[PDB]
Amino acid sequence: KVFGRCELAAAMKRHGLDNYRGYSLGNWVCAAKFESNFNTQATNRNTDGSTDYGILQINSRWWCNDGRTPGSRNLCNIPCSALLSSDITASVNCAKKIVSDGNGMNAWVAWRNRCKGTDVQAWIRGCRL
């Protein structure tokens, strides 16, 4: 599913991401934009042979089982394919573990490089939330 900006903001607020660990809704939408272009089906292979999955490009090296990343953890205890669903529940719950693990939203390179220190509130401007 390819979300609208405001549709995704609204889906994310309902799943408890608005200000989760001090990160305003704008941050999560900005990261989804540059990670996946708001496409739940987004996949990308890493140089190490791990794969990034879904709206927030969650990595098979640490977070999900794709059965092809040797010596990887499944710290969200899910198949990576659950992260590609039009239901973002599995992606949101897993992102809550990731942003709690000590590095906050710096775990997402696109956030660090494209969202951090920008006006992120711009990403939810005009949305009915």
List of residues contacting Cl ion (CB under 5 A):
104
Copy the structure tokens of residue 14. 């309902």
Give the sheet arrangement for strand 51-53, strand by strand.
43-45, 51-53, 58-59
Binder to Na ion among 36, 51, 57, 72 (CB under 5 A)?
72
**Using the rule CB under 5 A, is 43 a contact of Na ion?**
no
Do the Cβ atoms of 61 and 69 come closer than 8 Å? yes
101 is in an annotated binding site: yes
- Name the catalytic one among 18, 52, 66, 87: 52
Q: How, if at all, do strands 51-53 and 43-45 pair?
A: antiparallel
Residues classed as catalytic = 35, 52
List binding-site positions for substrate: 101
Residues that bind Na ion (CB under 5 A): 60, 65, 69, 72, 74
